[PDB]
Write a protein that binds this ligand. Sequence first.
Ligand SMILES: Nc1ncnc2c1ncn2[C@@H]1O[C@H](COP(=O)(O)OP(=O)(O)O)[C@@H](O)[C@H]1O
Ligand SMILES: Nc1ncnc2c1ncn2[C@@H]1O[C@H](COP(=O)(O)OP(=O)(O)O)[C@@H](O)[C@H]1O
Ligand SMILES: Nc1ncnc2c1ncn2[C@@H]1O[C@H](COP(=O)(O)OP(=O)(O)O)[C@@H](O)[C@H]1O
Lengths: 499, 490, 503
Amino acid sequence: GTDSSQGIPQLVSNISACQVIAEAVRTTLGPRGMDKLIVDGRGKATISNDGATILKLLDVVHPAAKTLVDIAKSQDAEVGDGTTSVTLLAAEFLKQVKPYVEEGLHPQIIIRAFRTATQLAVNKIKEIAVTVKKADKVEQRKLLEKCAMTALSSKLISQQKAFFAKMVVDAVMMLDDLLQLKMIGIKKVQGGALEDSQLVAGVAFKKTFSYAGFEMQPKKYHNPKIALLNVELELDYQAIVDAEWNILYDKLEKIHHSGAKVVLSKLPIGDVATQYFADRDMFCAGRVPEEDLKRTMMACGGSIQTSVNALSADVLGRCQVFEETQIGGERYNFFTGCPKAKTCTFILRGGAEQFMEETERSLHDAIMIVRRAIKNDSVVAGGGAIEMELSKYLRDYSRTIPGKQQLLIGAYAKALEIIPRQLCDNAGFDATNILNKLRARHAQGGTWYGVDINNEDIADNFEAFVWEPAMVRINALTAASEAACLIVSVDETIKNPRS
Amino acid sequence: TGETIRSQNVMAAASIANIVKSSLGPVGLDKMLVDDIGDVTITNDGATILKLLEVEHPAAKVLCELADLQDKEVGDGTTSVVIIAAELLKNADELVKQKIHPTSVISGYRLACKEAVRYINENLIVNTDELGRDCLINAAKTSMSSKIIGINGDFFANMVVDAVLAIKYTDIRGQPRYPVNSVNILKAHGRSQMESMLISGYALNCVVGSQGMPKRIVNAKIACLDFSLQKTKRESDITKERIQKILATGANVILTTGGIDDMCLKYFVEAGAMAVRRVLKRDLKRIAKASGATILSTLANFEAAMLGQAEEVVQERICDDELILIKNTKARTSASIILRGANDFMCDEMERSLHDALCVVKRVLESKSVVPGGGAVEAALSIYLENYATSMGSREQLAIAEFARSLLVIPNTLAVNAAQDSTDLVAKLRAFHNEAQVNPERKNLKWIGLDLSNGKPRDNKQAGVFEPTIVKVKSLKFATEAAITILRID
Amino acid sequence: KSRLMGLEALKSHIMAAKAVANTMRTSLGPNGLDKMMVDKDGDVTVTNDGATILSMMDVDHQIAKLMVELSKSQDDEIGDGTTGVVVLAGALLEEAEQLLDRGIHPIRIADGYEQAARVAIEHLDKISDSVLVDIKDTEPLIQTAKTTLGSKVVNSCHRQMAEIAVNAVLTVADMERRDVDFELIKVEGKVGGRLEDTKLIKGVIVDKDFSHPQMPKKVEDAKIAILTCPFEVEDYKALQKYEKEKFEEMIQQIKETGANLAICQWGFDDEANHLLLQNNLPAVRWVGGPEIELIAIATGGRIVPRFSELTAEKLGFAGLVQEISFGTTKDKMLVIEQCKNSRAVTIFIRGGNKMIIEEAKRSLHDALCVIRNLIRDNRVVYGGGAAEISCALAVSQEADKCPTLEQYAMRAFADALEVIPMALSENSGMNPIQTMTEVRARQVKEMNPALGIDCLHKGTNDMKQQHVIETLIGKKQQISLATQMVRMILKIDDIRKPGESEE
Ligand SMILES: Nc1ncnc2c1ncn2[C@@H]1O[C@H](COP(=O)(O)OP(=O)(O)O)[C@@H](O)[C@H]1O
Ligand SMILES: Nc1ncnc2c1ncn2[C@@H]1O[C@H](COP(=O)(O)OP(=O)(O)O)[C@@H](O)[C@H]1O
Ligand SMILES: Nc1ncnc2c1ncn2[C@@H]1O[C@H](COP(=O)(O)OP(=O)(O)O)[C@@H](O)[C@H]1O
């Protein structure tokens, strides 16, 4: 029997709920952090190393955890996935301020101190942010591939990922129209070596029983476009024979009438009658995925047909080239060659089937890091280095403040130390020794020394090419501080239940 | 349920410290100690509290033993050492909980203690020289503050400091030494204390001995005795032959504790001897050690050169009271302070304040090395040790950091018992001491402590709140030793 | 009240994984304990192949689930050694638990296991003394079939099924892609019979009925049709007239197209069948639907369910003339085998029990798959645990030259790879530890790498005479998949089950 509804008890319960929601996702921090399985409730368990996804799929019942996870989601929708460094940071702020609240410090004093410390840190970070945007990035991008391949060093993948980074950066440059992760993806192809994997400027989907109608389509056709169909193409007692015959006749006639090159439908196509479906004289498809559709009308320009024999000029319209090849021994589907093809789907050719998760956790950050480096100019060292620098500034400045805010700003500064600690703990190397050495060498030697994820030692992340834009870090820190102050400001909760 | 017996020891220590925490400082609250048979005891200082508290936990017994041992060294800081040890135990327990082995914690604590005792030795005060005048004055006033006599504080202050300085000895080692019992009290009737003048020698307020003492006699020899010169019925009647023999040996001023002689008047104009009833033993021993004479139980027999000497004797009336001016003897022990007023009862707080001022002056006179009080030194070392720890880089960084953080409990407790929020006082102390090192020009700021009367930061080198260096050094050493002994337990 | 956080969840995962492995560790090897299977309905079957047991086992824990679904991704590439994969995974999990007992972080254990696996891969590459000329290896293939079928009395007629299999794959092996497709199903299970009843028939056999109870089965003509049209006294006279008109037009379509044996999958009138028999052509009613592909592929034709698609080049084809007693008491079927060998050939099996049919077809599938690997890559290593012992020795040697915690992972991986010979010895009813360590000492003192476990209690532990062999790429794939299994399950630290509210 444990209850808490008064002001201070309410605050301590709320920040304990924040503690538990942080513990739920604490260990996933870092490029090579732990991974978690969560069941969806019907048996389709989900596995994902991402931190934001865990919060998205997590059920939250506590109001404090609810508002914290809403702040996290708000952070997610703006810039990448900083939620890992925000939920954890805010929750450990609350954990650090626990005893001061317990001793009777008024929450308004805490909020004022935290806001002052946040303003000081955001103002102080801008004197350290360094821009290398001009220094050989768009032209002579060797620095940009250096930063990209920094992501997965100390691996045998480095030889292949060098070419991988060069080629994906080529794709980004030729599609530098604010690319997202929706228009760019990876498609698993069984077999082959890692070096065999390539890129195609179009969709890539395997043909199944219900997916493709017939082979030997006119691949080298100079103007193939997409056709969308909402009517079935499949095959009083005798009163349905004539209707079925007429339906089949008009379905066969429509393909030649409208002249559609490839027809995409939301219905299965029977490959047991492959020759029967080949009588249309033109290629027809069914069971198209939603992503495949969305990637084909905004690039090629496919039309929509809803009638039995609907005709349009966008079934055989203007698109560059059609591709249909047996990639890896299996014939895939490629709606490439589009006038405004903002599409670069990565052909994942590899032997092991489990390498899909490696690509999920390995290359979507590489495209993410290169896009982040391109979009912004000024960056600071990562791996917790900037957190230690901010902690040093704030801890040293706190002792110059007479008044209650001194202890609180000191607690905020020492709270800022969690990120390097969490990184090195997820790496498996014990946090105390590495963190102490980092603190000493960082308060003395340099302003950018940070944890190394590979050799487990103090590494100059600036010269290691670990770039984090100043604006993204600023926004993440501000959001975390705002969440902490918002939780602190709450002292009473009202429910008003049904019965 | 229960586990990690180390935490149990730490909690026992924390409880023991919390029993005595609130009594720290001159303004501490009292504790009422109840025994099995029901008697009660009221006291302020926690030394007797530990000496009287019924300890039962084996871990707490170690702290009690170490505090008692600390009492045997200098007799102060037992509350402070217990509180510091408890804070160290709590912080070390937390460090253990965060996966730091106690061995590294112990090593860090040892290094922190050594660094603290080295840092303090180069930031203390040895200005208790002949040029230290105002510091002693306002130290006496601070020990005498919050009293109605603050209107005329300076006169009593300079009087008492002159009295204490003029009577100093010089021992075998050459270190000046002061007996508190050397100076005594002397009441007077009539005008108030504002006209009290320091008496250069011991003065007794009793019947007038004789008028035969000149304005200043060339030789005044103290032939003190202990019998009553009374006619009875080397002499059967001890009135004439023994006094004649002692005068032949060269006795100028024969002291008689008991009754006066019947015919002393004729003998006191040719020899000038003393006859006043009820000579106090406390003052008799002091005057004997001053002039150098010894008390003679019997005279029937060494007596010529062994007896003491006095430079001059003055017969005068002070505050409508005749006093005997046996002053300027061989060794400076003979001195008294006249308490002008009406009775000692209405000026009980006045004489008690004078006594405590004399005590706080003699604390700083001996052990010429002195440090500021009022939590100044704790804040200074707390600032020092964090910067010292951040330059190590070993596993002992957190140990020294927590040592520095826990060292602030003494000023915090002092502020708490002073009815001010300890947060503001501690923060202000730390802020003042921060610029004491990061700003070299503001070097004359280390001696900033907390004032218990007003609850605001205040310089204590100028104020006079002072402590012997040995007391704090031993307190820190013993707290570290107790903490290490507790952490070694498992 | 209670919760499962931290490394306790990982310990529970290891417990579940080792429970599953202990379940599967008794059926490994030719002498492995057979395992019946029961369904909720009550179906009873007894199978020794672990792939089926994994596939249809009911597992409740999410760890064991993940195990079985990502273990099912082994049969398609190889089809053999799934039991080996699971046993190795359980051994790795148990050794990982042993390491975690001493405070090692799971990430370090996983990376050490990964390096141990790759090192074992190169070592196993360098140790194998395979033969690369086994293309015209019809005689060694007999030994391969015997080894794949040495668990039962099957060796009595292995002297027949081995050449059955080599002829089957010879009719299937093509030197341009070297694989078996969907339509090449070489399966025909007939319940009841004998070991001799399972013989070599390159024909199409179906369980359908005749046109007439005593119709002449001798239809050598390849003009065989397929009908997708179903059956869809005033009304009786109208129906009779419609039937007559449909018969006349369908016969006219036959004459125009040349598709005589019009087999229909629905009801009809037997009078038309009698009239057609009078016209020297049969017409079978109520035939199977998806049997068009198998019938047409008898000489190379494809499915032609359209009325006019079945032309001369795509007639209902027949395999090769033969007429024997198809069934004594069972309804004999048509002779649909006259003309030419089938690219998608199908063999005839008439084993005397359901389980013998199952084991025969699964063994044939594994044999064709492994030799498909052989023509793809003719690299083999001697099994029986000899490869495992060699890899264990190499890994143990590699254990010293590393200063980090990787040495512990090296040692654990070696002690886990050594489990397979232990399992083989145990399932053979003999002291596992003693026999395995004796073979290990023999291999460390004598450089022979083909010294394994004499599971069949034959002469020597050396498989050179015993001809126990398996493809090298199979061993590499098995080891790599097991290592990826343990690596990816070792990452997982917490499972948050919805619905089960934490009270
Ligand atoms: N290869 C690396 N080496 C060192 N530090 C890294 C590396 N990759 C990421 N980090 C650090 O991990 C921290 C947290 O990253 P995280 O927020 O989990 O990534 P995401 O933004 O994808 O969620 C970042 O501040 C970054 O500095
Ligand atoms: N006049 C004063 N002004 C400020 N602080 C004082 C004063 N006198 C004593 N203290 C404080 O009291 C603390 C302990 O003194 P005390 O209680 O007399 O010793 P103990 O604790 O051994 O009995 C010291 O740390 C000192 O700072
Ligand atoms: N000739 C043989 N003598 C002894 N053991 C053999 C022989 N041939 C194969 N084995 C054993 O069979 C095991 C593999 O069979 P198994 O894994 O049960 O097949 P599946 O992979 O279909 O489950 C190997 O561990 C090997 O030791």
